[PDB]
């Protein structure tokens, strides 16, 4: 086509989606990770995670307001990944890298799994 | 903070949101523009437009499944702007620029209004 493109548009959209999440506006699901609860937008979760994409395209699970994750999932690892979904920024630290990588593998977030593997390999 | 950032994350999210729109997955509103209907996600509309942000934060309008736009709004101008919301690409042409600018002014999409004004000024 002969379209023009606004470079900062995708980033501005994600910033506003994160502002809606922070104010709990039009969030339609709560993700339960052991004792912890995280409110989010199903569309953003699907757009970032192969696991959520599979869950919310399922004809019965698409209508659930609560999703319980596997008990082995660490709430902090989930929190860090949820923040990454809504910001593009990943808070990867020596103290959380193992939990973040395991959570990213479960959530099917291949770019996160890739950077965790590289950061671990460099420390070996 | 000490975060790392994935450059293509915002663009990848928007691409997936557009794929969900194309397959009519988790769309929660229909925008009526005279004889034409457009299905979309309320969160994306709010993230892109000052008008939709005001409508869907309203305690009664947030629950509507149908929104009717002003009869002066051109369906093609709306279609072009809806495509821009979901892709960052604006199909701006001599034959549609007036309708696109008027629709962007109504929808409160200031970056679109700005490029339309500049493109019009250059042709004068």
């Amino acid at each position: 086509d002969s379209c023009i493109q606004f470079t900062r548009h995708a980033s501005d959209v994600l910033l506003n989606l994160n502002r809606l999440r922070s104010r709990d506006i039009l969030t339609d699901v709560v993700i339960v990770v052991s004792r912890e609860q995280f409110r989010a937008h199903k569309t953003v979760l699907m757009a970032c995670s192969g696991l959520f994409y599979s869950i919310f395209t399922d004809q019965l699970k698409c209508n659930l307001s609560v999703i319980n994750l596997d008990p082995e999932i660490n709430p902090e690892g989930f929190c860090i990944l949820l923040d990454f979904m809504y910001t593009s920024r990943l808070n990867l630290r020596e103290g959380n890298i193992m939990a973040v990588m395991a959570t990213a593998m479960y959530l099917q977030m291949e770019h996160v799994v890739d950077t965790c593997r590289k950061f671990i390999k460099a420390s070996e | 903070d000490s975060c790392i950032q994935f450059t293509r994350h915002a663009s990848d999210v928007l691409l997936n949101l557009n794929r969900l729109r194309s397959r009519d997955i988790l769309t929660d509103v229909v925008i009526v523009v005279s004889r034409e209907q457009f299905r979309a996600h309320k969160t994306v509309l709010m993230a892109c437009s000052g008008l939709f942000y005001s409508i869907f934060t309203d305690q009664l309008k947030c629950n509507l499944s149908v929104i009717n736009l002003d009869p002066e709004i051109n369906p093609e101008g709306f279609c072009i702007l809806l495509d821009f919301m979901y892709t960052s690409r604006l199909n701006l042409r001599e034959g549609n620029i007036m309708a696109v600018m008027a629709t962007a002014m109504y929808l409160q999409m200031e970056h679109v209004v700005d490029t339309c004004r500049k493109f019009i000024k250059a042709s004068e």
């Binding site: 379209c3 023009i4 493109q5 606004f6 470079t7 | 690409r89 604006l90 970056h111 490029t115």
Partner: peptide
């Protein structure tokens, strides 16, 4: 704005 750019030419993509």
């Amino acid at each position: 704005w750019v030419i993509p």
